[PDB]
Amino acid sequence: MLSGLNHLTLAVSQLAPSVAFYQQLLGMTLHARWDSGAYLSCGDLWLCLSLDPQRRVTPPEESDYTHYAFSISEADFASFAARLEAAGVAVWKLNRSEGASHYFLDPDGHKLELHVGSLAQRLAACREQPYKGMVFF
Amino acid sequence: MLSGLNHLTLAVSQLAPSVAFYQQLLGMTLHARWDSGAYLSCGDLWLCLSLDPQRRVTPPEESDYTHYAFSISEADFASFAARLEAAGVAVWKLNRSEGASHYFLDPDGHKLELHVGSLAQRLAACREQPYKGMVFF
Ligand SMILES: Oc1ccc(-c2ccccn2)cc1
Ligand SMILES: [Mn+2]
Numbered sequence: 479m480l481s482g483l484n485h486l487t488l489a490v491s492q493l494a495p496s497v498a499f500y501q502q503l504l505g506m507t508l509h510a511r512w513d514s515g516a517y518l519s520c521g522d523l524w525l526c527l528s529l530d531p532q533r534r535v536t537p538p539e540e541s542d543y544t545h546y547a548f549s550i551s552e553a554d555f556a557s558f559a560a561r562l563e564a565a566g567v568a569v570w571k572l573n574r575s576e577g578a579s580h581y582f583l584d585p586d587g588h589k590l591e592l593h594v595g596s597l598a599q600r601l602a603a604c605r606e607q608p609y610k611g612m613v614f615f
Numbered sequence: 616m617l618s619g620l621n622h623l624t625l626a627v628s629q630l631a632p633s634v635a636f637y638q639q640l641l642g643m644t645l646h647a648r649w650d651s652g653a654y655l656s657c658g659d660l661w662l663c664l665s666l667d668p669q670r671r672v673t674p675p676e677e678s679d680y681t682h683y684a685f686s687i688s689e690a691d692f693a694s695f696a697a698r699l700e701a702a703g704v705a706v707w708k709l710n711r712s713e714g715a716s717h718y719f720l721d722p723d724g725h726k727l728e729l730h731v732g733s734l735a736q737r738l739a740a741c742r743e744q745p746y747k748g749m750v751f752f
């Protein structure tokens with residue numbers, strides 16, 4: 479069967495600024511770069527940045543809610559979010575509708591998130607404060 | 616410090632066919648559903664389906680190369696690809712890289728992949744046959 483996420487590939491319009499964002503700003507590990515892409519890791523996540531002439535810098539009001547959340551500890555969450563804010567990283571959402579989260583954009587407008595907590599923790603929180611119509615299996 | 620992918624959220628135009636696709640066709644575990652979304656797991660992956668009237672059913676020629684690859688064993692790959700083919704799931708690319716890959720579309724045109732092989736395997740292959748301009752770190 480399927481066992482998890484093998485990799486996340488993000489199309490990017492300008493490879494060097496995107497590598498700098500993920501490695502320098504977000505702290506991910508850079509493993510390789512070539513003329514058309516890069517491979518990074520974030521814990522167990524394999525991230526590919528793929529140079530794509532079709533990628534457009536997309537304002538958040540123009541894209542749907544598809545987004546990519548990265549795990550961060552409770553102890554690190556606020557200072558990391560505040561550092562992104564002080565660095566001028568653009569945002570796309572403020573209401574914490576799914577727990578402790580900070581929503582921000584990559585250079586091409588990919589929708590990113592910092593989140594504290596596991597799926598189990600989110601299910602437990604939702605039992606007390608459920609989304610409308612919520613059913614648990 | 617970021618420790619991994621916390622969750623992947625896909626915007627969906629119609630919740631029921633998307634739940635059917637990820638749970639029934641792709642075998643993921645459905646943990647909860649509400650009026651505007653669902654939570655599933657696939658191994659360590661926390662997947663959220665979010666009902667979004669902004670999501671367009673998008674032909675693959677009209678989206679960039681951003682895509683989401685799921686892990687599968689080599690032994691299971693061919694029968695899972697055959698399952699997707701029997702269900703009439705569209706393919707958006709042929710494999711030309713190392714490791715088995717099947718490139719398929721979700722009901723809204725999200726670009727998905729089945730892949731066999733880790734980042735370590737890819738890096739080893741690349742060291743032996745580097746892409747144009749490739750540098751390792
Ligand atoms: O194809 C390449 C082009 C540029 C680089 C690079 C990496 C780090 C810093 C500056 N340039 C690597 C490979
Ligand atoms: Mn989220």
Ligand SMILES: [Mn+2]
Binds near residue numbers: 682
């Ligand atoms: Mn891929």
